[PDB]
């Protein structure tokens, strides 16, 4: 053992152990090892990390240092040759609503975040990276390949900063560099409430005993709540419209406002906590502040576990759903709840499900206004279009009535993310989400494609021919072997995403395995899973078994017509029924009467 346990973790964390509510930090879930499943620890390593020096350095950092006797291609080149595409016609998913994309990004944010390293508070190292494109330290710039239109217009590289890691922060190893997971691994609404105590209350409304979440005071949505503004300037949401002067939001998770449609969902969620607290009180007026917030918070994590596990994963995993996640068999103490370093890349399949435009729909679900359809790239860190362009209900309608993008081997990721990404502190709509992902696999030390196929007990192509049969694509196979030179070197993100989709799901076999096992572990390692006997009353569970993403829209917007199955593709008004026809979360079983 390199080190059996390493430094840099909050020491002052201790366990009640008979309390009914999860900690904010994830700590105390597991009794045998308390730190397991908690924020600010290291991502689990299902397989030994693979670095250039075997410790912390990434493949593609030292030019002459090959991986298996071959230079790894530049991320941007893999981006340009395989990932990109021009024609947006015929890419939409006939049977996946835009909500299908959004929910994956929401679930993913609840489960994992590996942030960039610090010490850039007043760093021109941050800038040195920006301006002179010099590779050093944590500055791991993405260099453009010769023949790249960004050479001509943007400079020599796209900045990129290595992710945070445990113990020594700048910069030390061993044990071989292990990256941080800043959020709780349990599916527990951390994205509404925060994963630090400091954030969590910062966000509660403690100016009153009602247990409500702190809302916006400087703006409203037909009298409905909006998430509070984050007052940390420099703010990028201000930076996108110097005029509009509208900052990003404050949510339990830092990425809330990365695009308007994620910000939107956050909104629906905050509204759900407040909405619920008023009710707990009405039925239980005696209940204090904490009692109200804790119990609403508990209802909420349970709602996310149900939508995720009953509605969402079956349609992501397909046939592969039972092979990996069999019907719940109760809490298992031996199960390692931690998110693995590789899941955070596996879950990135969502990137190829993001479309190039967002829509606003009116009451008749028709283009609301002159400019209802907008390019995705003018919606990164855009909050002003919610508050000042007539409200969320129309973005929510877009979500129901528009279609997710289908992953496509010849059409993987839209240019909106591929050439136009806005990243905070960097100024242009000019970054590349695909290249980022690849540079990151390398930063996080991921094992190649074949290691992961090995891990999942799948065949391991060694030849152009081999790869053709697995991907079922001759040209993709060939491009990939022309750059990688062997499948042993293919970055997992691309490797996994290249595989044709399994039956009735949205990922290949490699990912259905990577995804399948992770989620199974987070459901089986949660002392607080909702269906865990003892956590809710039988009664209470028969009341949650009814919740629906349709219901969540009804109870928290002025939309009065919704689909019954929100994630399949639903055209108005055939597939649309009035809210009246939809099952309500009967909170009656939460009555706690003293006499
Ligand atoms: C338009 C919507 C989206 C945008 C603009 C976006 C953008 C980003 C960005 C900038 C990062 C940070 C990458 C890095 O610096 O390494 C990221 C990471 C990630 N994305 Fe997305 N993404 C979107 C949608 C999604 C979806 C739909 C999914 C899954 C269904 C997803 C899953 C992830 C995951 C798991 C991470 C890594 C987070 C971590 O560090 O644990 N994203 N995305
Ligand atoms: C910045 O925000 C303002 C709105 O806050 C945008 O201006 C609006 O756009 C049209 C006219 O151009 C009108 O329908 C709105 O009523 C305008 N409002 C105001 C105050 O001008 C403007 O387009 C945004 N700029 C950018 C670059 O996004
Ligand atoms: C806190 O709750 C009180 C009581 O409803 C309300 O008047 C106030 O607006 C809330 N404050 C904030 C900052 O959200
Ligand atoms: C508990 O999890 C461990 C780890 O796989 C394993 O022994 C077993 O399958 C599970 N079963 C029970 C009954 O806890
Ligand atoms: Ca979580």
Distance 480 CA to ligand 5 centre (A): 35
Phi/psi at 95 (5° precision) = -125, 30
Q: Which of 71, 58, 65 is nearest to 161 (CA)?
A: 58
| Cα–Cα dist 428/385, whole Å | 19
| Residue of 555, 543, 580 whose CA lies nearest to 396 | 555
**Can you say whether the dihedral through the CA atoms of 516, 522, 523, 525 is positive or negative?**
positive
Cβ atoms of 250 and 228 closer than 8 Å? yes
Nearest CA, atom 14, ligand 3: 214
Helix (H, G, I), strand (E, B) or coil at 204: strand
- Whether 377 is catalytic is no
Per residue, the 3-state secondary structure of 358-422, as one string, reads: ECCECCCCCECCCCCCEEHHHHECCCHHHHCCCCCHHHHHHHHHCEEECCCCCCCCCHHHHCCEC
> For residues 260 and 12, what is the distance between their CA atoms, to the nearest angstrom?
37
Radius of gyration of the chain (CA): 24
Report whether 542 contacts 528 (CB < 8 A): no
In sequence order, which residues have a C-beta less than 8 Å from that of residue 374 and are 6 or more positions away?
Answer: 357, 358, 359, 385
- CATH number given to 1-595: 1.10.640.10
Domain assignments of the chain as residue spans, ordered by start? 1-595
Q: Which bin fits 407, alpha (ψ -120 to 50), beta or left (φ > 0)?
A: beta
Helical segments of 8-123, H only: 75-78, 98-111
Return phi, psi of residue 240, to 5°.
Answer: -75, -35
Contacts for 184 with CB less than 8 Å, ≥ 6 apart: 25, 26, 37, 38, 39, 190, 195
Q: How far is CA 100 from CA 75, 179, 241, in A?
A: 28, 29, 29
From the list 567, 465, 458, the residue with the least C-alpha distance to 97 is 567
Q: At what angle do helices 549-556 and 260-283 cross, to 10 degrees?
A: 80
CA dihedral defined by 240, 244, 245, 248, rounded to 10 degrees? -60
Ligand 4 lining (C-beta closer than 6 Å): 332, 334-335
Residue pair 93/100 in contact by the 8 Å Cβ criterion: yes
Chain breaks in the chain (C to N over 2.5 A) after: none
Contact 253, 191 (CB under 8 A): yes
Resolution in units of Å = 2.6
Size of the chain, expressed as the number of residues it contains:
595
Question: In a mutational test of the pocket of ligand 2, which residue from 260, 388, 422 has the highest number of ligand atoms less than 8 Å from its CB?
Answer: 388
Among candidates 239, 275, 277, which has minimal Cα distance to 257?
Answer: 239
Q: Which residues are annotated as a binding site?
A: 108, 110, 184, 186, 188, 190, 258, 351
CA of 99 to the centre of ligand 2 (A): 27
Instruction: Tell me how far apart the alpha carbons of residues 524 and 324 are, in angstroms, rounded to a whole number.
Output: 12
- CB-based contacts of 574, cutoff 8 Å, min separation 6: none
Alpha carbon distance 38, 30 (integer Å): 10
- Please state, as a whole number, how many other Cβ atoms lie within 10 Å of the Cβ of residue 260: 25
The experimental method is: X-ray
């Amino acid at each position: 053992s390199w080190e059996v346990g390493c430094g840099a973790p909050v020491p002052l964390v201790t366990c009640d152990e008979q309390s009914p509510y999860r900690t904010i930090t994830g700590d105390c879930n597991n009794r045998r090892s308390p730190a397991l499943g908690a924020a600010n620890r290291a991502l689990a390593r299902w397989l030994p990390a693979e670095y250039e020096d075997g410790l912390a350095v990434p493949f593609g950092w030292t030019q002459r240092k090959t991986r298996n006797g071959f230079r790894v291609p530049l991320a941007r080149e893999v981006s340009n040759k395989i990932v990109g595409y021009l024609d947006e016609e015929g890419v939409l998913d006939q049977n996946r609503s835009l909500l299908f994309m959004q929910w994956g990004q929401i679930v993913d944010h609840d489960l994992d975040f590996a942030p960039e390293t610090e010490l850039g508070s007043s760093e021109h190292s941050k800038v040195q990276c920006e301006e002179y494109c010099v590779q050093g330290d944590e500055c791991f710039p993405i260099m453009f390949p010769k023949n790249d239109p960004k050479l001509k217009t943007q400079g020599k590289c796209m900045p990129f900063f290595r992710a945070g890691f445990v113990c020594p922060t700048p910069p030390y190893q061993s044990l071989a560099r292990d990256q941080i997971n800043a959020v709780t691994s349990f599916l527990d609404a951390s994205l509404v409430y925060g994963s630090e105590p400091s954030l969590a209350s910062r966000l509660r409304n403690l100016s009153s005993p009602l247990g409500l979440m702190a809302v916006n005071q400087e703006a409203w949505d037909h009298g409905l709540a909006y998430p509070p503004f984050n007052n940390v300037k420099p703010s990028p949401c201000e930076f996108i419209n110097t005029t509009a002067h509208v900052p990003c939001f404050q949510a339990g998770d830092s990425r809330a406002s990365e695009q308007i449609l994620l910000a939107t969902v956050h909104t629906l969620l905050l509204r759900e906590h407040n909405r619920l607290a008023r009710e707990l009180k009405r039925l239980n007026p005696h209940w204090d502040g904490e009692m109200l917030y804790q119990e609403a918070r508990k209802i909420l994590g349970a709602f996310i576990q149900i939508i995720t596990f009953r509605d969402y994963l079956p349609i992501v995993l397909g046939s592969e759903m039972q092979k990996w996640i069999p019907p719940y068999q109760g809490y298992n103490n031996s199960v390692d709840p931690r998110i693995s370093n590789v899941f955070t890349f596996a879950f990135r399949f969502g990137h190829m499900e993001v479309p190039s435009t967002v829509s606003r729909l009116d009451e008749n679900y028709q283009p609301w206004g002159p400019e209802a359809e907008l390019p995705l790239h003018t919606l990164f860190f855009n909050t002003w279009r919610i508050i000042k362009d007539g409200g969320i209900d129309p973005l929510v309608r877009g979500l129901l009535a528009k279609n997710s993008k289908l992953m496509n081997q010849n059409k993987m990721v839209t240019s909106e993310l591929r050439n136009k990404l806005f990243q905070p502190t960097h100024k242009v709509h000019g970054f590349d989400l695909a290249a980022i992902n690849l540079q990151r696999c390398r930063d996080h030390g991921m094992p190649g494609y074949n290691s992961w196929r090995g891990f999942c007990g799948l065949s391991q192509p060694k030849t152009l021919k081999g790869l053709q049969a697995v991907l079922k694509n001759k040209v993709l196979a060939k491009k990939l072997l022309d750059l990688y030179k062997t499948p042993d070197n293919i970055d997992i993100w691309i490797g996994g995403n290249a595989e044709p989709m399994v039956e009735r799901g949205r990922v290949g076999p490699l990912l259905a395995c990577l995804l399948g096992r992770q989620f199974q572990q987070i459901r089986d390692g949660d002392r607080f899973w909702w269906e865990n006997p003892g956590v809710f009353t039988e009664k209470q569970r028969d009341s949650l078994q009814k919740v629906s993403f349709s219901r969540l829209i009804c109870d928290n917007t002025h939309i009065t017509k919704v689909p019954l199955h929100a994630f399949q593709a639903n055209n108005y008004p055939h597939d649309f029924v009035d809210c009246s026809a939809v099952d309500k979360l009967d909170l009656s079983p939460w009555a706690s009467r003293e006499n």
